[PDB]
């Protein structure tokens, strides 16, 4: 339903148009509501009296359950526990509060429901913002890699910046380390996993010397297919002129960029 | 006065649980514990006898 744990909670512990919002009831009971006036003037006696009796002297309520359920629901929507664990932990927290209760505890509980509401919102927006963890992993890997290439350097650093931009600009992409290598998955539960360490090791020898040799397919077999996928995934990035043209790497990047381009364009055209 | 008699050899209590999806049952249990959703009952021959 709603992600805001306050909202996704308050649907559970609440009546409908009771005296929790006193102003609306008091407006409707006299005549003040304009949507349908004289509605309350013509109800049975008991009901009328009862509301009125409720209205003049409100009845106090115990909000402990509401706050505890709010924080429990926040934990559930934030993958702190499984839903069955949610049903259990609600009672657990309820007992915990009930055996240590104090005004200070209620104050801290209100503070906590505010904090968890903010936490859920922040987690969602951060998960849709770019997943800083992948950026950290990529920076660690790049620190592992050397920053100096004896044959050509502008293309190398340009490509490195292009990769950085690619991992930053597309959230849901994963960068991590499983074994003694770093990888790059284009999506959770997704295919196209590139062995980043192996790709860089293979590509180290092709940076500044494959420009004159791009015309002859004599060294074309040096490109392992994993690195070919790695280059393919960066076709939309590293636009023309970023990588020096007339280079085997540059030629491949330009071809892939042109191909992907015709495609998306034609596709948004559809019909 | 007619010798009729009866003995209880053994007695057991049975119950039937509806197999509910655990997450659904958990959320239902959470909702049913708040004050606003208390269960209520009355009785058909609401009455009193004299």
UniProtKB/Swiss-Prot annotation, chain A:
Residues 9-19 have a biased composition (Polar residues). One of its GO terms (cellular component) is viral capsid, decoration. Its main location: virion. The modification Phosphoserine is found at residue 220. Residues 133-246 are annotated as: Binding to hexon-linking protein. Induction: Expressed in the late phase of the viral replicative cycle. Belongs to the adenoviridae hexon-linking protein IIIa family. Structural component of the virion that acts as a cement protein on the capsid exterior and which mediates the interactions between the hexons, including the peripentonal hexons, and reaches all the way to the penton vertices. Two hexon linking proteins IIIa, one from each facet, stabilize the unique edge interface between a pair of facets. As the virus enters the host cell, hexon linking proteins IIIa are shed concomitant with virion acidification in the endosome. Interacts with hexon proteins; this interaction tethers the peripentonal hexons to hexons situated in the facet. Interacts with the penton protein (via N-terminus). Interacts with packaging protein 3; this interaction is required to promote correct genome packaging. This is Pre-hexon-linking protein IIIa. It comes from Human adenovirus C serotype 5. The lineage of its organism: Viruses, Varidnaviria, Bamfordvirae, Preplasmiviricota, Tectiliviricetes.
From Swiss-Prot, chain B:
Transmembrane segments: none annotated. It comes from the Viruses. Induction: Expressed in the late phase of the viral replicative cycle. It is found in: Virion; Host nucleus. All late proteins expressed from the major late promoter are produced by alternative splicing and alternative polyadenylation of the same gene giving rise to non-overlapping ORFs. A leader sequence is present in the N-terminus of all these mRNAs and is recognized by the viral shutoff protein to provide expression although conventional translation via ribosome scanning from the cap has been shut off in the host cell. Major capsid protein that self-associates to form 240 hexon trimers, each in the shape of a hexagon, building most of the pseudo T=25 capsid. Assembled into trimeric units with the help of the chaperone shutoff protein. Transported by pre-protein VI to the nucleus where it associates with other structural proteins to form an empty capsid. Might be involved, through its interaction with host dyneins, in the intracellular microtubule-dependent transport of incoming viral capsid to the nucleus. Belongs to the adenoviridae hexon protein family. Homotrimer. Interacts with the capsid vertex protein; this interaction binds the peripentonal hexons to the neighboring penton base. Interacts with the hexon-linking protein; this interaction tethers the hexons surrounding the penton to those situated in the central plate of the facet. Interacts with the hexon-interlacing protein; this interaction lashes the hexons together. Interacts with host dyneins DYNC1LI1 and DYNC1I2; this interaction might be involved in intracellular microtubule-dependent transport of incoming viral capsid. This is Hexon protein. It comes from Human adenovirus C serotype 5 (HAdV-5). The lineage of its organism: Viruses, Varidnaviria, Bamfordvirae, Preplasmiviricota, Tectiliviricetes. The gene is L3. The chain holds residues 603 to 652 of 952 of the full protein.
């Amino acid at each position: 339903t709603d992600p805001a744990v306050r909202a996704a909670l308050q649907s559970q512990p609440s009546g409908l148009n009771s005296t929790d919002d006193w102003r609306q009831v008091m407006d409707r009971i006299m005549s003040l509501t304009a949507r349908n006036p004289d509605a309350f003037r013509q109800q049975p006696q008991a009901n009328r009296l009862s509301a009125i009796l409720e209205a003049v002297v409100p009845a106090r309520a115990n909000p402990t359950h509401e706050k505890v359920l709010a924080i429990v629901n926040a934990l559930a929507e934030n993958r702190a526990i499984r839903p069955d664990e949610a049903g259990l932990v609600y009672d657990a927290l309820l007992q915990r509060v009930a055996r240590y209760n104090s005004g200070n505890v209620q104050t801290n509980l209100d503070r906590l429901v505010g904090d968890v509401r903010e936490a859920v919102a922040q987690r969602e927006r951060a998960q849709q913002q770019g997943n800083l963890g992948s950026m950290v992993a990529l920076n660690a890997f790049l620190s592992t890699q050397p920053a100096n290439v004896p044959r050509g350097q502008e293309d190398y650093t340009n490509f490195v910046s292009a990769l950085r931009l690619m991992v930053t600009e597309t959230p849901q992409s994963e960068v991590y380390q499983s074994g003694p290598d770093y990888f790059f998955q284009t999506s959770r539960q997704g295919l196209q996993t590139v062995n980043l360490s192996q790709a860089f090791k293979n590509l180290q020898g092709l940076w500044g010397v494959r420009a004159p040799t791009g015309d002859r397919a004599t060294v074309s077999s040096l490109l392992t297919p994993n690195s070919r996928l790695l280059l393919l995934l960066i076709a939309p990035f590293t636009d023309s002129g970023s990588v020096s043209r007339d280079t085997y790497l540059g030629h491949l990047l330009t071809l892939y960029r042109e191909a992907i381009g015709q495609a998306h364009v034609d596709e948004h055209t559809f019909q | 006065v007619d010798g009729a008699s009866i003995k209880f050899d053994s007695i057991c209590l049975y119950a039937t649980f509806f197999p509910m999806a655990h997450n659904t049952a958990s959320t239902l249990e959470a909702m049913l514990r708040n004050d606003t959703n208390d269960q209520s009952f009355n009785d058909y021959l609401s009455a009193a006898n004299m």
